[PDB]
Design an enzyme around this catalytic site. Sequence first.
Site, PDB file in Angstrom:
ATOM      1  N   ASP A 199      -3.985  -1.026  -6.269  1.00 39.68           N
ATOM      2  CA  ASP A 199      -3.829  -0.685  -4.837  1.00 39.68           C
ATOM      3  C   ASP A 199      -3.839  -1.961  -4.008  1.00 39.68           C
ATOM      4  O   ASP A 199      -4.546  -2.908  -4.324  1.00 39.68           O
ATOM      5  CB  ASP A 199      -4.935   0.283  -4.382  1.00 39.68           C
TER       6      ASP A 199
ATOM      7  N   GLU B 181      -2.867  10.210  -0.902  1.00 39.86           N
ATOM      8  CA  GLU B 181      -4.055   9.372  -0.884  1.00 39.86           C
ATOM      9  C   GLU B 181      -4.514   9.115   0.546  1.00 39.86           C
ATOM     10  O   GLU B 181      -5.710   9.097   0.815  1.00 39.86           O
ATOM     11  CB  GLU B 181      -3.804   8.042  -1.602  1.00 39.86           C
TER      12      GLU B 181
ATOM     13  N   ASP C 253       0.828  -1.233   0.000  1.00 42.52           N
ATOM     14  CA  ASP C 253       0.000   0.000   0.000  1.00 42.52           C
ATOM     15  C   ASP C 253       0.850   1.266   0.000  1.00 42.52           C
ATOM     16  O   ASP C 253       0.980   1.864   1.000  1.00 42.52           O
ATOM     17  CB  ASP C 253      -0.793  -0.066   1.314  1.00 42.52           C
TER      18      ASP C 253
END
Length: 326
Positions: free
Chosen positions: A211, A156, A117
């Site tokens: 992702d 993000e 991630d």
Amino acid sequence: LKWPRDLRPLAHHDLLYMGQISEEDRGDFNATLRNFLVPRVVGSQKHREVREFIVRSLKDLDWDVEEDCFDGQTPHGIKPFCNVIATLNPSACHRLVLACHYDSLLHKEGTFIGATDSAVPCAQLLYLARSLNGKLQNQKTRGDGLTLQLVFFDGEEAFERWSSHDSLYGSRHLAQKWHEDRTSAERLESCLERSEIANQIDRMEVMVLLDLLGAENPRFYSYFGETQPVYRRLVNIESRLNDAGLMELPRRRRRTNYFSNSSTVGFIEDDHIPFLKRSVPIVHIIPSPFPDVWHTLDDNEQNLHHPTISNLNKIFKAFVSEYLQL
């Protein structure tokens, strides 16, 4: 409605070539990945080093690289953000966009590597560009109005408890910037006949967002009816690679089944959301459920599953080759 671009099935020869990973390639992928297996929180030196490494690696392959840098308010005060946008052929009307985020979560429990991630996705994008460079540079010369674009979103992650105002800083910013940047087909190279282009957003033909990749045996589903034709190509490619015996499994006669031939009802907050809201077609390559290590200190290099990563790399290489007819 049909997909706007007629999707030519990958020839057997090209499937086999894209499904081969040499010892060199493994070494190259892992060397690239090493650069991302560091804490890279927004505001930090390592984050700046990671950004610069992405930029250098893509400029070295003769891509156009732009940085969309801005300061944004956060729960931790003003922070600097920089999206990295790399475009193989800037003048090509339409872009196959592959994307991920390069920032890492500021975890209160301690140093957080965020290997799935999204260190692995970051490395996968660079690996695609490097490993396909020859074929990509040839494709770029065709004047066919299609190119590859890689977007490494910044910011993000939320700084505190997730909210619409504290998350997706880079993607919200870029989606707005590109929506407001007006253009038309006559300013662009070889748009498809019935294209409706009013701004830069419209040139994103599809955004494939990677992702939380790198854990063993991910399960993907088609999250969006809009992109079912593209998603089905991932299902098909995966099936053909197994038929060809090109997947790494622990036992003979097993097959991978990462891409389910089904949809699921789920809402995931990620960098696609601001683009989805402007009707960009999304393929969201994220597992459901999330990896067990999600947002824990165990999301680290040793919990990665290398055979899965290699298998995903083959699917992604074959997918880009199919889409761009490399």
